[PDB]
């Protein structure tokens, strides 16, 4: 029962950036803390152990330092291949335990979602079912709002979203939310919008159709 | 060079059993300790226990004491996880790394590729395709965006493409999200040119191996309804 906890969860940087993440421990663990880095879909690999020795292989821009409770890695100059999840874990028991992790994103400049609204397509409405589509596209930070109203109501519950990884040439995000009702909900109902709040916005921005003039 | 290598992805029902296998290459595998660590979806990495092949002593997590089995068979280098009732609960990737002392601590040095495990209620099922395209009169911008939302399928993953692998720029396709039903839904959108709208077709194809099935969607909005 020794828990680690990483701070913070998640970093923007630039290549070239010193990055500092630390790792705190709920008791002493000595020397014993070893850090590690994972890609999406692969394994982690091990980058430090002993709080400050270097794996073999592993480049010496990657250093680690603590000792006790508090510990911290340190990547200098920061490159491409270093957009990555971090991971502490300590071994000073045989019952190993986990950090929560630290993703470290690419930094960029504000960027403005362009938005965009789908309504539900007839052939899934013969079905029983109307999905309502909002989009954002190509935006940075990756914190956004997004609501959905039907005639003039937000709505709760009823909607899903998701987002794409940092895009390999802007790194932008993008987002999708989808809002769904039954057929004979939608048809009640006359006006539907998607309200967006970002930084890049100076007030939020709301798409919306009606039904019957779509 | 030290390699483990894990034992494929696995789809199961919940009270099914399950064994999987990390098979150990490249150095003599009853002179170290193998780790097992799960990875929940969207989550971090969690310590599960080890087993010592040389003695086959295992050692496990609080939290996964009782709750599954770590085994070994040395004479053919593999060690092995185990389930005798699955919950949906259990639906992670799962890791086995090679320990290695040094530093006068455990490390894991080298790591298996993972094994998914996905357990669900749901049954195989190909996805839906419906199109995302614009109302007649809202393109007003110089670039418009077009999709397909593909829903209802299970389990992952989809392939999409469009305009049969022609079209490649623009295109996000969205991490599918899992519905109340049990069944992924996700979208894949392209931004185009507004001018191309009358002018060029386009068209997303959806694979899904899992059924068997292929979906191809034109992207249109209808004059009428
Ligand atoms: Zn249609
Ligand atoms: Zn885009
Ligand atoms: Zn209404
Ligand atoms: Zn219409
Ligand atoms: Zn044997
Ligand atoms: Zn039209
Ligand atoms: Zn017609």
């Known amino acids: 029962d020794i828990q680690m906890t990483q701070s913070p969860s998640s970093l923007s940087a630039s290549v070239g950036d010193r990055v500092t993440i630390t790792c705190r421990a709920s008791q002493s663990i000595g020397l014993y803390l070893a850090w590690y880095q994972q890609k999406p879909g692969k394994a982690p690999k091990l980058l430090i152990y002993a709080a400050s020795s270097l794996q073999s292989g592993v480049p010496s821009r990657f250093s680690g330092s603590g000792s006790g409770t508090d510990f911290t890695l340190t990547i200098s100059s920061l490159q491409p291949e270093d957009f990555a999840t971090y991971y502490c874990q300590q071994g000073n028991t045989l019952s190993y335990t986990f950090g929560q992790g630290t993703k470290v994103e690419i930094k960029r400049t504000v960027a403005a979602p362009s938005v965009f609204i789908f309504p539900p397509s007839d052939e899934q409405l013969k079905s029983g079912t109307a999905s309502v589509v909002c989009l954002l596209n190509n935006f940075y930070p990756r914190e956004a709002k997004v609501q959905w109203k039907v005639d003039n109501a937000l709505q709760s519950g009823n909607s899903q979203e998701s987002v794409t990884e940092q895009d390999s040439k802007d790194s932008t995000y993008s987002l999708s939310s989808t809002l769904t009702l039954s057929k004979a909900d939608y048809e009640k109902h006359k006006v539907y919008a998607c309200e967006v709040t970002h930084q890049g916005l100076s007030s939020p921005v709301t798409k919306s159709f009606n039904r019957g003039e779509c | 060079e030290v390699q483990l290598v894990q034992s494929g992805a696995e789809v199961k029902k919940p009270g099914e059993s399950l064994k999987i296998s990390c098979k150990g290459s490249?150095?003599?595998?009853?002179?170290?300790?193998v780790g097992w660590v799960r990875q929940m979806p969207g989550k971090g990495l969690e310590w599960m226990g080890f087993i010592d092949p040389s003695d086959s002593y295992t050692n496990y997590a609080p939290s996964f004491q009782g709750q599954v089995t770590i085994s070994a068979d040395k004479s053919i280098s593999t060690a092995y996880l185990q389930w005798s009732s699955l919950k949906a609960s259990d639906t992670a990737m799962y890791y086995c790394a090679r320990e290695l002392y040094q530093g006068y601590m455990d490390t894991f040095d080298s790591w298996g590729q993972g094994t998914l495990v996905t357990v669900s209620s749901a049954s195989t099922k190909g996805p839906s395709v419906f199109p995302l395209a614009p109302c007649s009169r809202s393109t007003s911008e110089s670039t418009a965006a077009l999709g397909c939302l593909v829903k209802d399928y299970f389990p992952e993953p989809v392939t999409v493409s469009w305009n049969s692998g022609a079209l490649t720029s623009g295109v996000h396709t969205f991490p599918a999200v899992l519905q109340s039903s049990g069944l992924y839904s996700l979208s894949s959108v392209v931004t185009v040119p507004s001018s191309s709208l009358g002018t060029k077709t386009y068209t997303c194809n959806v694979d899904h191996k899992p059924s068997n099935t292929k979906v191809d969607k034109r992207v249109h909005h209808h004059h009428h309804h």
């Open positions: 490249g150095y003599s595998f009853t002179n170290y300790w």
